[PDB]
Amino acid sequence: AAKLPKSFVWGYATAAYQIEGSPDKDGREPSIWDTFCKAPGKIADGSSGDVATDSYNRWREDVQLLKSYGVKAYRFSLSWSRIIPKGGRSDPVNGAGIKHYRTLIEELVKEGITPFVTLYHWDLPQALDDRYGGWLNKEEAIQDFTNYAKLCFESFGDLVQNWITFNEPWVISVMGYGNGIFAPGHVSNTEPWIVSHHIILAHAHAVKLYRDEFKEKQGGQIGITLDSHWLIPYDDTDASKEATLRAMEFKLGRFANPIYKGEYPPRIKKILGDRLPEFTPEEIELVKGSSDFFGLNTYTTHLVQDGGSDELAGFVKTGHTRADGTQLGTQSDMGWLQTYGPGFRWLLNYLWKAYDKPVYVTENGFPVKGENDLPVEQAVDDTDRQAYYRDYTEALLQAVTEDGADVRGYFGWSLLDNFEWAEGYKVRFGVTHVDYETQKRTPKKSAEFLSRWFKEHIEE
C-alpha cells in the first residue's frame, strides 16, 4: 500500500476552554467565553466550561492517553487569561499559568510527542473586552496580541517548533460578532469585518515578530488555521458556479488571499464597500506571505446555490441535499455536517494549488448522531465515526501520495468528548468517551482505527 513520508505527523487536537475546567484556578481570570456561558439562552443545554473534562487538573493522564494512542503530535491551545489574566501588555503576568503549560509541554517532549500550539482559540481575556472591546480596537488588540505571542515564544519556544496564531478567524468574526451565536455575542453588519481585519493584522504582527526574533534560534514555523468546507455548485448554471466562488471568498478567500497572496479578493470588496476596511501599503506588505504553513480545519462538503439572503454567508444558500433529493452522506449529530470523503481530497488539492504552502489539517472529525444518549458500552462502538475516519484518511493518502498535494499533518478532532461551545455537551466529537460524572476516559473503537491506520500508512 501507499504510505505518507516518515516526516508526516498525526495526532489529536483540543482547545483550552473546551477541556480544561478550573476556570479560576492558579490565577486564571475570566475569558469572554466564561462570561458568555453565564448568559441565559446562549448555550443549548445551559452548560459551561467550568469543569468540562477537567483536563487542567488531569493534564498528565491526557498526555499518557495520547502516548498510549501512539500519536506523533498533539495540538492544543493556550488560555490567554491563564498567562496574562487581564490580557494586556501592561497587566501582571501569571507565572503559575505559564508553568502549567511549560510542564505540560515538557511532558509531551519526554513522551516524544510534538506539540502544536494554538495561541488563540477564542478565549479572549474578558478584561480586554471591557477595556477596549477586544478585537474591535485595532491598535490596542494588535499590541496586546503581539505582546502575548512574544511572551509565549519566550516561555515555550525552546521546546515548541510549531505555532498557530489563530484558530478559525471566520468563526471568531461571524459567530462572535456577526450573528452573536458565539462569544462575545455581538450582532452587526460591520463588526465582523472589522474584527477579521484586525485579526489578520494581529496575526501578521505576531508572525513578523516570530520570524525576526525567534525563528532562527528556535527553528520553528508559524501559521494560521482557517476553516473551510469543500464547496460544490448546486447545478451547472452560471449562477451556481458564481455563487460557489462567492461563497468561497466569504468563507476562506477573505482571509487566505490577504495572508498568502497580498490583498482582499474582488467580490467581497465590491459587496461590503466601506464596511470592509482597507489595508495601508505597509500593512499589505506585512500581511502578504505571513503564514509558513496552511493550517486547515475541515469537516464536510456543501452544495451551493445563488439567492441567499444572509450577507455573512455571501448571499448564498448551502446544504447537503441535491436537486434530486439525494443526501451527500451519513448524518452526524449536527445537520450541517455529513460524511463526504471525496470533498476532503478535492479541498486538499485546491488549497495546495491556490496558496502554495504545506497543508496541516489541524482539525477533522465527526460527531455520531445521538451519541450523547448512549451508555459507554454502546458509545465505544462508534461505527459512523470509524467510517468517517476511514473515508477521510483514505482521501488524505490519495491526495498526497497519488495526487501530489503537499499535506504534512493530520489532527483528529477531538481527543475527548468535550464542551462544544453553543451546543454544550450534547455533541460528542471524541475518539475517547468521557463520563462527565466520573471523568473516566474510555477509548472508542475509532481511536484504535486511527492508531492502526497511521502506524500502517506512515513510512517506518
Distance of CA 405 to the CA centre of its chain: 21
Tell me the C-alpha to C-alpha distance, in Å, between residue 438 and each of 46, 53, 71, 392, 442. 20, 10, 25, 32, 11
331 is known to lie in a ligand binding site = no
167 is known to lie in a ligand binding site = yes
Nearest Cα residue to 178 out of 166, 195, 165: 195
163 is known to lie in a ligand binding site = no
Catalytic residue among 20, 29, 168, 249: 168
Q: What is the DSSP letter of 281?
A: H
256 contacts 354 by C-beta, under 8 angstroms: yes
- Residue 348 belongs to domain with CATH number: 3.20.20.80
Domain tally, the chain? 1
Calpha distance 52→434 (Å, rounded): 10
| Structure resolution, Å | 1.5
287 contacts 204 by C-beta, under 8 angstroms: yes
Structural method: X-ray
Give me the residue label for grid cell 532562527. Answer: 216
413 is known to lie in a ligand binding site = yes
Nearest Cα residue to 233 out of 244, 225, 223: 244
Nearest Cα residue to 9 out of 353, 362, 292: 362
320 is known to lie in a ligand binding site = no
303: phi then psi, degrees, rounded to nearest 5:
-95, 140
258 contacts 328 by C-beta, under 8 angstroms: no
Calpha distance 429→412 (Å, rounded): 9
Helix (H, G, I), strand (E, B) or coil at 316: strand
Tell me the residue range of the domain where 396 lies.
1-460
User: Does residue 363 carry a catalytic annotation?
Assistant: yes
N-term to C-term CA, the chain: 13
Catalytic residue among 20, 29, 363, 371: 363
306 CB-near residues (< 8 Å, 6+ apart): 239, 240, 242, 243, 315, 316, 317
Pairing mode of beta strands 316-319, 301-306: antiparallel
> Burial of 113 by CB count in 10 Å (0-12 exposed, 13-18 middle, 19+ buried)?
buried
